[PDB]
């Protein structure tokens, strides 16, 4: 491994061997069907709202999120990088597809598959990933740096459906070597969204953009139809000329064939035929190839950039709505712009590398923080692009100034912006893309007073319930199977209109977004103020016994739905107290004295009653009326956690909060599998896990990271990082369960999981306040 010195991979990059087998992998722990795409994953490519492409550590383009809201795991075997190498003096060279595997069926059988084990490494520190290729049969060593321009405070490049592959080649031997690098890509128009004739009309063309000191050669893979539909658009691959390399290409090879039409050319001398052919296909799958070839002398290094783009302008949801994706603002809407996107990338990628370095450097240069924490912090951000992200630039048909945004809870529970989950999981957005965050909260503000009196069947018990009640904040902003943004509360497993936690969380999210963007945006507080007042007022009506706190009813009425709360709970109670104190402060800022005095009076009566009902000398009781009332809940003081972030001071005494957190560490962390798997939700005071519900026996990964940040702000540094380490270990480490780039909601003590690719563990960014 001499190639690693010639590139700059950071020490905190997650690492694994190409073709490595992982034996300890976790699986779903529920009865009902659930996504398990295996441990063969990698860092995604593509911007926010663009659709994403997961290229795995084995090299394959396998996890397809190009249909917005859907997860489709299947390797498109034609999509590869391949290498030819020939030492001078030798009669024949050697060709190899850089993929640790082979096709299932007989297509592309002529290609050299099965990249051998122990001959290269994969590295990832999102948005960057790397592959090194160190093979005894290949005297020249190769490496590639791949990424998309995911850049905080940038809402432009961050939206781009593009990826750059920056190759580096070095000759450590004492002989000249001829080398070629080839990018192949299938014309994937019709991969999704086309009901019949899936390849019909697909055709490939070659663009040669000649100019002074900048030759670009690219394949544009599109369709002869100009229909403005979900399925129609273009893919493009290409490369930029550099000193010392020649470019060659093949416009059309058959992907539904043995591939020797391409491979007989490449395997001979690493040079393609330069055959243009715009003939449309009927049933055969087609693809394009772009190759560079060059001669490396002993000790010579050379660098060459390839790129990939996809112009698929329209996203369609199952309810019928068609929207334009965000990137169309900068490239157009007609779906004929893939070359323009590719060109932009090939000419500006170095500026993008530096911009990515600029935002990662403040954390990476901090030597007080361990590498493992940095690994988790950056790589958890994968989900912002991979979470079925929807970011609209006009409805098809239809002008407006705001661009609506949605991030899925996950793919098993296909709900956009689930409010509970984004309470924990929206920290990266508020901290790194605050204009998206504020847009999402305005979307919620506009739904507060929506009344939908039509009745739906509740999934858990079969009872009938009203869809959306006036003054109650929605559970979610729709599903990709139906109508995101337009039809809210797609969730039907419980009735969220009776929930005691969502209205409080909403108000806390509003004040968080004011506080964490500099306490400057009065216009935002102005816009949300009436919804905030309405949210707290409706929740006050649920106070039955008149202690100033809404009563949990012993039935599903908060996010830990099946782990039943009754009376005053520590969870909803603390959130209620924090929400009231946040609303006081908004009242002061907007000079709404009536509201200030009201929410101040409610706060004082509730604070007093919360402490009297729940404080037990060591921690705060789960609730006042359940059979598991004295359980130690990991999330018991969630309101105080947010109160620290929002700079609202003490809602509860400092001494009591410190004892409560120490107890959670002593029990929920350290007595659950030696503190190596995070904080289990519920533990009994005797030291055994609360078995009253499945949710109590689960570690929730986002809750554990949030708890770690709470510990961190309260000076409990060892406890914070030790608590968070178990989540890192399980996700990323060789002794974990193989959840890298699909961090789940939860696992049980055996390490098996519920709901991979989950939003909540983005809460790790709460540790960077
Ligand atoms: Ca009450």
Numbering used by the authors: 31 to 428, 431 to 801
Publication passage describing the model:
Previous work showed that the TxGH116 D593A greatly reduces enzyme activity, suggesting that D593 is the catalytic acid/base. The decreased activities were verified by kinetic analysis of D593A and D593N, which showed ∼30 000-fold decreases in the apparent kcat/Km values relative to wild-type. In all structures, the acid/base residue was mutated to asparagine (D593N) or alanine (D593A). The D593A and D593N unliganded enzymes and D593N complexes crystallized in the space group P21212, isomorphous, with wild-type TxGH116 crystals, whereas the crystals of TxGH116 D593A in complex with cellobiose and laminaribiose crystallized in the P212121 space group and had 2 molecules in one asymmetric unit. The overall structures of unliganded TxGH116 D593A and D593N, and in particular the position of amino acid residues in the active sites, were similar. However, the loops of residues 523–534 and 583–597, the last containing the mutated acid/base residue, as well as the side chains of D452 and Q727 in the active site differed from those of wild-type TxGH116. The different positions of these residues may optimize the hydrogen-bond interactions in the active sites of the acid/base mutants and reflect the flexibility of the 583–597 loop, which was shown to adopt distinct conformations in structures of wild-type TxGH116 solved in different space groups.
Although no X-ray crystal structure of human GBA2 is available, structures have been solved for Thermoanaerobacterium xylanolyticumTxGH116 β-glucosidase, which shares 37% amino acid sequence identity with human GBA2.8 Instead of hydrolyzing glucosylceramide like GBA2, TxGH116 exhibits high activity toward 4-nitrophenyl β-D-glucopyranoside (4NPGlc), and β-1,3- and β-1,4-linked glucooligosaccharides. The TxGH116 structure contains an N-terminal domain, formed by a two-sheet β-sandwich, tightly associated with a C-terminal (α/α)6 solenoid domain that contains the catalytic nucleophile, E441, and general acid/base, D593, residues, which were verified by chemical rescue of alanine mutants. GH116 enzymes are retaining GHs, as shown for Saccharolobus solfataricus SSO1353 β-glucosidase/β-xylosidase, human GBA2, and TxGH116.6,8,12 In the retaining mechanism, catalysis involves two carboxylic acid/carboxylate side chains with one serving as an acid/base and the other as a nucleophile. Here, we report the structures of Thermoanaerobacterium xylanolyticum β-glucosidase (TxGH116) D593N acid/base mutant in complexes with cellobiose and laminaribiose and its catalytic mechanism.
